Structure 1
Amino acid sequence: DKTVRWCAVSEHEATKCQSFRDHMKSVIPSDGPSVACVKKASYLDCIRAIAANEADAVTLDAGLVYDAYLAPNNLKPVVAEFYGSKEDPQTFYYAVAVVKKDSGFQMNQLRGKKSCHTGLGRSAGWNIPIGLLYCDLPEPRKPLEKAVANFFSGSCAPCADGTDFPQLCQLCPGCGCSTLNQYFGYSGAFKCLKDGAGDVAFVKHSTIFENLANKADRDQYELLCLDNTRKPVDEYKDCHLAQVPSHTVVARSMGGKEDLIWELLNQAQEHFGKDKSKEFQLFSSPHGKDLLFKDSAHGFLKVPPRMDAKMYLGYEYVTAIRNLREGTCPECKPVKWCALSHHERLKCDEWSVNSVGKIECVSAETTEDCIAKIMNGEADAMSLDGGFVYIAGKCGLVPVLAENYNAGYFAVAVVKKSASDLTWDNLKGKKSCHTAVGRTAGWNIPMGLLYNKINHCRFDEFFSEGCAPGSKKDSSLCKLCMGSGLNLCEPNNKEGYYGYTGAFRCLVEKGDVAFVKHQTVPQNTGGKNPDPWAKNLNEKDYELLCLDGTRKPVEEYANCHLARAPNHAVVTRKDKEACVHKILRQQQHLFGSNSETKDLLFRDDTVCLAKLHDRNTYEKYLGEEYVKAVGNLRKCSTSSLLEACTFRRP
C-alpha cells in the first residue's frame, strides 16, 4: 500500500484527519497515496508512534522538531508549512533582540540590563534568549526564573512568578499573563522597549515593522548579533538569536516515507488548499482551529533531502535549546579538524598527539558532510577550495585564514601545442577536462567567463563531451572520465581525472582543453611525475589559452591566465573564528615550513596560513566578480548541501 499514517493528537484532529482521508479518495487515483489516521494523546506520543513504525507523519513546532530528532526517535523534517503567500513563502521566523540606537552595549553585556519578554515559556521572548544566555546566568541556575531575576536588574516577564522573584515584574508589576498587561506579547515587549521601561526586547524579526511604519523611527533601533556587534533592524537575517521554522512535518530518518508524504500533501494542497473553495478545506475545520496544520498556512514546501533536524533548526537554535534541556556549562582549547579520508585522518591523528590535545579529529565521507559537521558543532574547521568556501559561506560559515603558496593562484586553460587551432574565442564542440564541478580553477572561473558568452550553464551542450567530476552520470561531461564502476565521474581520488593533476591527465589522454592552475603542467612534466601517463611529457608540448584569443607557453601564465583565483581557505563558525585564528598560527610556527601521499588537509604548495583582516566574509574574501559568476552557475548546480542552506536563506 501507499498509505501515509497521519498522527493526530486530539479527537478534533482525528475527525479532521478522517475527513481528509475520505476526500483524498475522491481526487487521488488508485495508484496514489492514501491517508490513515492514528490518534495519540500528545505530540510526544506521536513522535514515539512514528519512531515505532505505528505511524508515519505529524506536524510540529520547532521545540518538538528537536525532541523528535533525539535518540531513540530519530525523526527528520520532510515537509514545511509556508505562510504569507505563494510568491514569497514564509517558512521561518527569526528571534531577535531589539535595542535602542546608541544604548552602548552588546549581547555579552546584558547582565544588569532591563529586559522585555513576550512571555515566560514563549520561544522568541524567553526560551531562546535565556537558552543562549544560560551559562552567563549566576549559579545556582535552578530554578531558572530566580537565576534570570538575578541576571537582569529588572524585567517585564509576563507569566513569571513575581511573588517569589519581584525583579521579573519591575517593568510590569504583577507579570500579567494577558493582553491586559500593556507589555504582554510581541507588541507588548516591543512597547516595553520603545517606552523606555527596558533596554532590550526579545521578539520576532517582524515585530518592529508591525509597530513602526516609518523608517525614520526604526533607524533609532538596532539588533544585537551573537558576535557582539549591532546591526540595523532590517538586517535580521545576519543578526538574530535564532532562526525558527514555524510548522514542520517530520518522519523517520530511514524507512520514511518522505516521498509519499510529500506526494500526499502536495496533491492535498492542490485540491483543498488555500482558496480552492471545496466543502473540505485543508487549512480550516468546523471542528476547531489549527487542526493538523495551522489555519494561517498557504501551502507546503518540500524540505530538501540533505536536511537533518540540526541543519534545519540551525546552530543558534540548537545551542539555545540544548542549554535549556541539558543545563551544562564549561569550566578556548581543542580545535576539531574535519578529515575526508583514512589518510587525511591518519595525518590528523598524529597532528593531534603532536599538538598535545590542542587539535582533535573527526572524519566524514565527503566535503559537504564535513561542512555540515562544522555548521552543527560536530567539527570546527577544515580547509577548502574557493568553490567550497562559497558553499560554506552560504551555509553560514566564515573564512578565517588563507593558504599561501608564494592575490593567490592563477586559473589557466591548457591545450596541446600540436593542435594549434584552439582558442578561447571558440571552444564550441571541443572536449573539456575540469578538476570538478564547483571548484575555482576547474569550473567557477572558466565556466563563469563562458556563461557570459553563451548566457546559459548547460555546458554539456557547448562542449561535445568531457570529464567534469560531480556532473550527472548520464551527462556528456562524464564520458571522458576514467573511474570504474560506481567511481566513474565521482569528485574524489577513485576517479583518476579528478582534481588539478587529474584534469591535466584528462587533457593528455582524451581532452582538447583542461581548466587547471598555473603550476599544474610544470609539476606533471619533465619526469617530475613518475607515473606512466606523465613521465615522458615535457611542458613545451602544452600551451595556455589567453583571454586575447592568442596562446602562450606554460611558464608564461602571468600574462596568459583566465583570472586570479582566490586562495584555498580555512573555514569555521563565527563563534570559533577567534580560537581557530589563534591555534593554527600557534601550530604552524611549530610545524610549518621549519603529507604521506599528496595534499592532505592542506595543499603541499602551502608555506603558511595567512591573515585575512577585513575579508572574513565569503563575499569579501571571494570578491564580487567571483560571487556574481557562481550566482549565475547555481542555475545548473546539483549541490544538495547548497540546496538545503539556500532553502533556509534564499
Structure 2
Amino acid sequence: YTRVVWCAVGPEEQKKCQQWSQQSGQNVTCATASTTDDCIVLVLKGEADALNLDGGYIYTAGKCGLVPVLAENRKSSKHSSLDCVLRPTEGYLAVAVVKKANEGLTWNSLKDKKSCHTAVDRTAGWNIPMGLIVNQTGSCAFDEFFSQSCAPGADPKSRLCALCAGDDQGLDKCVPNSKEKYYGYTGAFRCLAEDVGDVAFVKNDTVWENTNGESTADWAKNLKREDFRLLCLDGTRKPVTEAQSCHLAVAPNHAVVSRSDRAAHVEQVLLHQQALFGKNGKNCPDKFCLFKSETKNLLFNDNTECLAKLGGRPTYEEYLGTEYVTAIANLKKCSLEACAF
C-alpha cells in the first residue's frame, strides 16, 4: 500500500510535485491534470490517491464519495500550547477588496463593475460572493452582474473571462490553474492591484501576504495596505485591519481528500512527509519544503504551518458545515443530489 499518488493541477504544481517525489524517495509520486475537477476524476477512477482542495471543490469531491483526510492549519493565537497537528483549525475570512482610490464603491454599487475571482466553484472567490449576489438580486443571472470578470473556469469567450490574461504567451486564457496570470488567491489580488478589476474576491490573508514588502514579486513589491479597502455587507468600507468585522463569510480551511479505502494510508504518509518537509521539517531549509512555492500557493497554501488531524472523523458535509453546504446547493440551482461526473 505504501505509495501515494498525488494529483497536481497544471504544469507548475506538477514541477513541485516531481521535486517532492524525488525527495520522498518515491513514497509520493505524481499524477497531473489541467483542472481541479479533472484531478478529482483521476482520484475517483483510482488513478491518483489524493490532493488538497478549496472547500468549493471539497463539495464537488464529496458529492462523488471522496472524504476529508487532513486540513490546512495556518498560524493562530488560540490553543497555543497544543501541537499544530492537534490544534483545531480556525477557518479563513472571505473578503471583498477594492482600491482606496476607488472612492464610493461599496457592496451596494457592485453591479456593472469589473470583478476578479480566484476561480469558478471556489469558496471565497465564487461560492460566497456569487451566492450572496444571487440571493440579493433574486436572480440566477450572476453571469450578467459584473460588466467584465476574470473567473477562471468560465466560458473563455464570455464576459466572465474577459479580464483573464492567460500565460506568458497569452495561452490558456481563463483556465482554472496557475498558468492563468490572474488564477487563485494571488492572481485575483493581482487583478485588483493592477486595476484590471474593481473588486477582488479573496481571503484576508491574501491582502496581508502581498503588501508592505511581504511578497517581493514585481507587481506586489510596491503595494501598500492603506491603498486597499474591504467591502462590508452593510455597505460600509473598512481598512484591511478590520477583517474580523468586515468579511463575507468564514470559510472552512483547504483540506486533503481521498477515497475512503485510501484515507488511512494517505494520512499516515502525509504526517510523515510534513515531519520531513513541513514548516519545522527535518529537511525543509536544507533540501525541500512542502509548504513553500514562492507566493504561488502550489499544491498547498504557502501560509500552511501544518496539515492537522480532523477528529470526529467528519463526513464532507460535517467538515464544510451545514451552513456552507446549503449555501452552495442554493447557488447550484442556477447552473438536486448527484455526482457531477
TM range (shorter): 0.7 to 0.9
Matched letter for residue 318 of structure 2: K
Partner of 2:233: 547
Mapped to 2, the partners of 1:536 and 1:347 lie a distance apart of 28
Kindly provide the CA deviation profile for residues 583-614 of structure 1, in whole angstroms up to 9, marking residues without a partner as x: 21122223221145432221111111111122
Mapped to 1, the partners of 2:106 and 2:37 lie a distance apart of 35
Matched letter for residue 69 of structure 2: V
Partner of 2:270: 584
Q: Does 1:494 align with 2:179?
A: yes
Partner of 1:645: 339
Q: Which runs of 5 or more residues in structure 2 are unaligned?
A: 76-89, 281-291
Mapped to 2, the partners of 1:525 and 1:342 lie a distance apart of 27
Partner of 2:20: 351
Matched letter for residue 544 of structure 1: L
Partner of 1:534: 220
Partner of 1:605: 303
Partner of 1:444: 127
Q: Which aligned pairs between 1:7-86 and structure 2 lie closer than 5 A?
A: none
Partner of 1:515: 201
CA contact (8 A) 1:615 1:621 kept: no
Q: Does 1:340 align with 2:9?
A: yes
Mapped to 2, the partners of 1:334 and 1:376 lie a distance apart of 17
CA contact (8 A) 2:10 2:178 kept: no
Q: CA deviation at 1:376?
A: 1.4
Kindly provide the CA deviation profile for residues 544-600 of structure 1, in whole angstroms up to 9, marking residues without a partner as x: 012222121112211111111111000000111111222211222232211454322
Matched letter for residue 236 of structure 2: T
Note closer, same or farther for the CA distance 1:589–1:550 as it changes in structure 2 (3 Å cut). Answer: same
Query: Percent identity at matched positions?
Result: 62
More helix by share: 1
Kindly provide the CA deviation profile for residues 80-105 of structure 1, in whole angstroms up to 9, marking residues without a partner as x: xxxxxxxxxxxxxxxxxxxxxxxxxx
Matched letter for residue 445 of structure 1: I
CA contact (8 A) 2:12 2:178 kept: no
Q: CA deviation at 1:335?
A: 1.6
Matched letter for residue 35 of structure 2: T
Q: Does 1:570 align with 2:239?
A: no
Q: Does 1:614 align with 2:299?
A: no
Q: Which aligned pairs between 1:180-329 and structure 2 lie closer than 5 A?
A: none
Q: CA deviation at 1:405?
A: 0.9
Kindly provide the CA deviation profile for residues 461-506 of structure 1, in whole angstroms up to 9, marking residues without a partner as x: 2222222111112322222222365522222233211111211222
Q: Among residues 242, 255, 258, which one is paired with 1:556 in the alignment?
A: 242
Partner of 2:79: none
CA contact (8 A) 2:96 2:201 kept: yes
Note closer, same or farther for the CA distance 1:339–1:391 as it changes in structure 2 (3 Å cut). Answer: same
Mapped to 2, the partners of 1:618 and 1:533 lie a distance apart of 37
Partner of 2:49: 380
Q: Does 1:367 align with 2:73?
A: no
Mapped to 2, the partners of 1:618 and 1:346 lie a distance apart of 29
Note closer, same or farther for the CA distance 1:602–1:558 as it changes in structure 2 (3 Å cut). Answer: same
Q: CA deviation at 1:615?
A: 5.2
Note closer, same or farther for the CA distance 1:358–1:471 as it changes in structure 2 (3 Å cut). Answer: same
3-state SS in 1 of match to 2:200? strand
Partner of 1:460: 143
Mapped to 1, the partners of 2:207 and 2:155 lie a distance apart of 28
Structure showing greater Rg = 1
Partner of 1:625: 323
CA contact (8 A) 2:9 2:177 kept: no
Partner of 2:84: none
Partner of 1:477: 160
Matched letter for residue 115 of structure 2: S
Q: Does 1:403 align with 2:72?
A: yes
RMSD: 2.3
Q: Does 1:593 align with 2:276?
A: no
3-state SS in 2 of match to 1:575? coil
3-state SS in 2 of match to 1:348? helix
Partner of 2:61: 392
Tell me the TM-score normalized by structure 1.
0.46
Q: In the comparison of the two structures, how many residue pairs are matched?
A: 312
Q: CA deviation at 1:392?
A: 0.6
Matched letter for residue 333 of structure 2: K
Matched letter for residue 332 of structure 2: R
Matched letter for residue 242 of structure 2: E
Kindly provide the CA deviation profile for residues 141-162 of structure 1, in whole angstroms up to 9, marking residues without a partner as x: xxxxxxxxxxxxxxxxxxxxxx
Where has structure 1 moved over 6 Å in runs of 4 or more?
Answer: none
Mapped to 2, the partners of 1:515 and 1:380 lie a distance apart of 30
CA contact (8 A) 2:12 2:179 kept: no
Q: CA deviation at 1:383?
A: 0.5
Note closer, same or farther for the CA distance 1:532–1:338 as it changes in structure 2 (3 Å cut). Answer: closer
Higher relative contact order (CA 8 A, sep 6+): 2
Q: Which runs of 5 or more residues in structure 1 are unaligned?
A: 1-331
Matched letter for residue 469 of structure 1: P
Mapped to 2, the partners of 1:635 and 1:521 lie a distance apart of 32
Mapped to 2, the partners of 1:465 and 1:528 lie a distance apart of 29
Partner of 2:332: 634
Q: CA deviation at 1:520?
A: 1.4
Note closer, same or farther for the CA distance 1:368–1:593 as it changes in structure 2 (3 Å cut). Answer: same
Mapped to 2, the partners of 1:428 and 1:459 lie a distance apart of 10
Partner of 2:78: none
